[PDB]
């Protein structure tokens, strides 16, 4: 007659690759539909069950690796028997649930999968970012190994317990998914769950390889195809998104937060490249996306100069100059900024030629004639060093 | 009776990957041993032979791609028939020497390899960075496709004309060699010869993804195993090298050239990791390499903070803290610098804990007590935002 409610719990995994922090993944676990599975994962994140594997220890995913990565399919972790300590070819062969006891571990020598428990919620793998249990390839062989899907995976349907979904840090999942692997899907780099636990919102969602700052109303996923705010042929909403993300970057640029400004401008570019309609599909918006793309390439060339990323600055200025029908004032900015980057790299001939094109394109340029003179002098100083 | 001398010529290829400049490769060509082959390559770099493929054109490697990359073997380019323009599955099937004429191109419809010429200097592929001609798998089928070896390649012995070697930019060759590929060795990214020509020393050797600045006497190759200055078990000379490279970094750091200082410190670390002897092999030098490694990790954590690379700074500080027997003053520097990076990332709990360990390890710390107070206030400000 009575039914107490407990909400789906939230847990987190912090990911580091070769001790370099990437960011936090926050997962929501399906307690109603998969209660034994949810309890196991929750407690392995929380790290408070005593280990039946070694006397002075707790079971936990902390320090565990992602030992199998298959792009366009899934990423797999959780061999806490072999996959966490040091010195095997054994990684991937083990696991241990919170239901294991020391008696099982002693008696069954040959087995390295302890506390196997029942399948639950054996549904379909339709959406990316679904959490499922890895098993030994037969019913009710769940222990501690799990995966996060990165695609639709219908071949898994009915075979693996579905127990959760990623809520925050979908981009970190994609970062893992793109790691180079060998032919067996083993990552070349050391991808680790560097910490884990129970999550709530005041703990935050760190991200190191892109910016998830909501400054300027940037609510959008890093990966444009993973965003869920609008439809894939809603060009007006896509353009709104790209503009918001651009403005977020500028707010950050004004605070001298150059790395995050760069991250936002790059994200805006990715949205543009993903959603921009062809001329015959939406004439006025195609023009608007193109104009925004020019602005983004110019912003990128400037902020990357500030970060001593001169190669990157040169790349983006070149993308801009290679576009059709770039207005002369924009061309002049691209040449000036590309020139500045070549100058920092002591590419004097290249810098000079860009600065000369800058003048042709905006001859009321003010700072430019002096810049050409400065470079001309450096080239003369160089010829003197050579001569001596 | 008479014999005029002409020296082996020098040519260059500038490499860009997705329009991002990587750097310059300078090759010396073996004119005596392979004169027809040398002439072909030299003129394809110089770009001054008129093209029999299209009327308003010259034959050149400019804009041509590396269409096959095999790590631990070679990198291959030079399909100037298909591999340079736009719109095929045909890339790799074509080539055209400077000896081709328009008559051949018209008459033989089915063939896309024009001006085939004779094998020369069919030797052994022993050393990395050897230039050889790709051919069609039978004698005297050389046109424009070529490769640079990255390893010993004895399976090629006697089958491919050897016509040169890399002199500058061996690291750029390694950068190409490490590009991700599909199962057929086709690079995922667009690796291009963005320019090429005849080289001489006043033109310089640009490098964008590392530093080849000889400041401080740094004469050593970027890749430690590719350096040729000392023997692989000469630990005294290896230690001298690592120290020189470190000092080069510091000279650059003092000029506020933070990106190149970073590049030098990373290179010094790579030399250390490559050449450091085990305790039982050379006791006093093992200790000296370990001490230098601690200093390098500390320098890295500071310079990367200056570059807004907080993830990288955190990584290197963590490598230092994970070493055995780190002196307390060094530990305190690592905690302070790791804390500073967490603070920039608004990881307040993490920053606070590092700053607290900093104090424990150097309690005559001066700036640290105020820093702990500053972070304590930010945490309180955060709790107020939450409460409101």
Question: Total domain count for chain B?
Answer: 2
Same domain, A169 and A254: no
- Residues A161 and A258 occupy one common structural domain: no
Q: Residues of chain A whose C-beta is under 8 A from some C-beta in B?
A: 16, 18-22, 180, 202, 204, 206, 208-209, 258-259, 307-312, 314-315, 318-319, 345-347, 386
Measure the CA dihedral B214/B217/B222/B224, to 10°.
170
Domain span at B131: 1-200
Report helix, strand or coil for B165: strand
Do B27 and B123 fall into the same domain?
A: yes
Q: Beta strand pairing status for B162-168 and B20-29?
A: antiparallel
User: CA–CA separation, A198 vs B169, rounded Å?
Assistant: 50
3-state SS record for chain A: CCCCCCCCCEEEEEEEECCEEEEEEEEEECCCCCHHHHHHHHHHHHCCEECCCCCCCEECCCCCEEEEEECCCEEEECCCCCCCCCCCCCCCCCEECCCCCHHHHHHCCCCCEECCECCCCCCCCCCCCEEEECCCCCCCCECCCEEEECCCCHHHCCCCCEEEEEEECHHHHHHHHCCCECCCCCECCCEEEEEEEECCHHHCCCECCCCCCCCCCCCCCCCHHHCCCCCCCCHHHHHHHHHHHHHHHHHHHHCCCHHHHHHHHHHHHHHHHHHCCCCCCCHHHHHHHHHHHHHHHHHHHHHHHHCCCHHHHHHHHHHHHCCCCCCHHHHHHHHHHHHHHHHHCCCHHHHHHHHHHHHHHCCCCCCHHHHHHHHHHHHHHHHHHHHC
Measured from the Cβ of residue B153, the count of other Cβ atoms closer than 10 Å reads 21
Separation of alpha carbons A210 and A219, rounded Å? 14
Tell if the CB–CB gap between A314 and B20 is shorter than 8 Å: yes
Task: Please state, in angstroms and as integers, the Cα–Cα distance from residue A199 to each residue in A19, A129, A331, B99, following that order.
Answer: 22, 18, 49, 70
Residue B180 and residue B258 in one domain: no
Residue A247: how many other CB atoms lie within 10 Å: 16
Same domain, B54 and B175: yes
> In this structure, are B268 and B194 located in the same domain?
no
**Beta-carbon count within 10 A of A363 CB:** 11
Q: For residues A146 and A133, is the Cβ–Cβ distance under 8 A?
A: yes
CATH number reported for the structural domain that contains residue A134 in this entry: 2.40.100.10
Of A208, A258, A311, the CB nearest to B209: A311
Domain shared by A257 and A192, yes or no: no
Task: Indicate whether A58 belongs to any domain.
Answer: yes
A245 and A170 within one domain: no
Residue A230 covered by a domain: no
Q: Are residues A366 and A278 in the same domain?
A: yes
Spatial separation of the C-alpha atoms in residues B103 and B47, rounded to whole Å: 21
Give the torsion sign (CA, A212, A218, A223, A229): positive
Residue in A365, A366, A253 with CA at minimum distance from that of residue A299: A253
In units of Å, what resolution does this entry have? Answer: 1.8
- Domain termination residue (choose one: A184, A200, A216): A200
Last residue of a domain, one of A200, A230, A261: A200
With a CB cutoff of 8 Å and minimum separation 6, the contacts of A159 are: A122, A135
| Contacts with A310 from chain B: Cβ below 8 Å | 208, 259
* Residue at B38 is within a domain: yes
Please report which helix (H) or strand (E) contains residue B361, including its range.
helix B348-361
Nearest to B40 by CA among B133, B140, B157: B133
d(CA A356, CA A363): 10
Task: Identify which of A21, A312, A345 has the shortest CB distance to residue B314.
Answer: A21
| Same structural domain, A196 and A244 | no
Residue B312 lies in a domain: yes
**What DSSP assignment string belongs to B61-91?**
-TT-BEEEEETTTEEEE--TTTSSS---TTT
Instruction: Name the token pair of B26.
Output: 């300078």
Residue B41 belongs to some domain of the structure: yes
The two structure tokens encoding residue B332: 């305190």
A94 alpha carbon, distance to own chain's centre: 28
Reference B11, options B282, B137, B273, B193; nearest CA is B193
Residues A267 and A320 in one domain: yes
Taking the CA of residue B19 as centre, how many other CA atoms within 13 Å lie in the half-sphere pointing to its CB?
12
Contact A346 B202 (CB under 8 A): no
In a domain, B187, yes or no: yes
C-beta separation of A81 from A53 below 8 A? yes
Q: Which of A308, A345, A346 sits opposite B307 (nearest CB)?
A: A308
Residue that is last in its domain, among A175, A200, A225: A200
Q: Looking at the domain assignment, is residue A211 inside a domain? A: no
Q: Exposure pattern of B199-230 as b/e (b: 16+ CB <10 Å)?
A: beeeebbbbbebbbbebbebebbbbbebbeee
Residues of A in contact with B386 (CB under 8 A): 202
Nearest Cα to B17, choosing from B175, B125, B146, B145? B175
* Those residues with Cβ within 8 angstroms of residue A196's Cβ, 6 or more apart along the chain or in another chain: A11, A12, A13, A14, A44, A45, A47, A60, A61, A62
Tell me how far apart the alpha carbons of residues A184 and A195 are, in angstroms, rounded to a whole number.
Answer: 26
My answer on whether B185 and B271 are in the same domain is no
Note whether B347 contacts A319, CB cutoff 8 Å: no
* Buried-exposed string A195-222: b where 16+ CB fall within 10 A, e elsewhere: bbbebeeeebbbbbebbbbebbebebbb
Handedness of CA B87, B90, B96, B102 (dihedral sign): negative
Q: Measured between alpha carbons, how far is A147 from A134 in angstroms, rounded to an integer? A: 7
Tell me, yes or no, whether A104 lies in a domain.
Answer: yes
């Amino acid at each position: 007659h009575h039914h107490m409610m407990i909400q789906d719990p939230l847990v987190y995994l912090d990911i580091s690759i070769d001790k370099k922090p990437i960011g936090r993944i926050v997962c929501k676990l399906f307690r109603e539909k998969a209660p034994k599975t949810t309890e196991n994962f929750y407690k392995l994140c929380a790290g408070d069950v005593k280990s039946p594997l070694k006397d002075q220890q707790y079971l936990s995913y902390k320090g565990n690796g992602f030992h199998r990565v298959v792009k366009n399919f899934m990423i797999q972790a959780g061999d806490i028997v072999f996959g966490t300590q040091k010195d095997s070819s054994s990684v991937g062969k083990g696991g241990c649930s919170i239901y294991a006891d020391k008696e099982e571990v002693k008696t069954d020598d040959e087995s390295f999968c302890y506390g196997n428990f029942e399948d639950e919620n054996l549904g379909e793998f339709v959406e990316p970012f679904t959490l499922g249990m890895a098993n030994l390839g037969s019913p009710n062989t769940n222990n501690s190994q799990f995966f996060i899907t990165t695609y639709a995976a219908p071949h898994l349907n009915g075979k693996h317990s579905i127990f959760g979904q990623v809520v925050h840090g979908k981009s970190v999942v994609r970062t893992i998914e793109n790691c180079r692997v060998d032919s067996d899907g083993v990552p070349e780099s050391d991808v680790r769950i560097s910490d884990c636990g129970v999550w709530e919102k005041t703990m935050g969602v760190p991200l190191y390889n892109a910016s998830n700052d909501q400054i300027g109303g940037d609510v959008y996923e890093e990966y444009p195809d993973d965003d869920t705010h609008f439809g894939d042929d809603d060009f007006g909403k896509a353009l709104e998104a790209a503009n918001i993300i651009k403005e977020s970057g500028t707010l950050l640029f004004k605070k001298k937060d150059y790395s995050n400004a760069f991250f936002k401008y790059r994200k805006s570019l990715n949205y543009i490249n993903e959603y921009m309609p062809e001329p015959d599909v939406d004439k006025e918006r195609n023009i608007q996306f193109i104009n925004l793309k020019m602005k983004i390439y110019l912003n990128l060339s400037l902020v990357l100069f500030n970060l001593e990323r001169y190669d990157d600055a040169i790349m983006y200025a070149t993308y801009l100059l290679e576009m059709d029908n770039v207005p002369n004032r924009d061309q002049a900015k691209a040449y000036y900024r590309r020139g500045n980057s070549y100058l920092k790299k002591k590419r004097l001939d290249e810098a000079l030629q860009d600065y000369i094109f800058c003048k042709e394109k905006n001859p009321d340029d003010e700072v430019i004639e002096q810049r050409i003179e400065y470079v001309n002098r450096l080239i003369e100083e160089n010829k003197e060093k050579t001569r001596k």
